[PDB]
Amino acid sequence: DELKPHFANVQAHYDLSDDFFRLFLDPTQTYSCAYFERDDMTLQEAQIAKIDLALGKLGLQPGMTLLDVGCGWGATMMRAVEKYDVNVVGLTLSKNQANHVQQLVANSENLRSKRVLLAGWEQFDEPVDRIVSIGAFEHFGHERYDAFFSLAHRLLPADGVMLLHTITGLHPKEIHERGLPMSFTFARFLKFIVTEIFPGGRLPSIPMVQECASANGFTVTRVQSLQPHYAKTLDLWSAALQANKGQAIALQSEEVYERYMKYLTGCAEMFRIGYIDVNQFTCQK
Ligand SMILES: Nc1ncnc2c1ncn2[C@@H]1O[C@H](CSCC[C@H](N)C(=O)O)[C@@H](O)[C@H]1O
């Protein structure tokens, strides 16, 4: 109400078709950087490793209520429930993800409380014990960053903790100063992504996040980069989508197929050269 969630911008991507995303994401449908804890893990094992890495920093205890901001297709929520025995609330602006997670909730045999809402954090006003947000922060926009942290710090308990996992990047007009190549290919890359893949998307800077967090009552006790892991994650995603080209075009179109391949491979290369990063910020209240 005070802040209208950007449903259209987010749904433009995530509500394309579950069957389409199923063509390149691992079984859990985790759509974020995996963690190859061991160099020989499969994409699936690596995604669970990333979920445990994030959830393991929140000091979870049975009965707690965990808030997942930008729950995607629900893998993180359901593992928090099954593995850590905490109640959960997931927020998403995607209709298909909400509907999908609602089915996981309907068929769950676990006794804990699980809720999924087709709503943004902008509309969530319930006290929670801990918060986890992986890959959603990039959709908030520069004009919501402060509002987001203020809300998170408010809803959390006295000794609350939020694990914010988000992509971060260097400004093109800075990579050029240090004498690094392809500063133009990078700027052009970012434009393509924000206009054809993630409308309204914004690339956060580590200093930016650090600033908004501290300025809102949080103490970032740790920053962990998984940069190299994303290049790998993206290469596995593009490898899968390519072998599924036929199903991709059939379910969608050659236009969508070609566009997503450019997106996936392009991102992988930008992580490979290190112009974009991904970090988990442990935010202590
Ligand atoms: N303002 C907002 N409030 C709630 N969810 C939001 C949001 N802006 C973006 N999101 C959600 O953030 C997610 C980005 S995709 C990441 C999904 C999941 N966390 C995973 O790691 O697999 C989507 O589910 C999108 O709907």
Ligand SMILES: CCCCCCCCCCCCCCCC[N+](C)(C)C
């Ligand atoms: C894998 C995505 C890499 C994006 C690199 C930088 C380009 C644009 C700036 C970011 C804005 C949108 C980010 C959306 C991230 C979505 N996922 C969590 C689903 C990957």
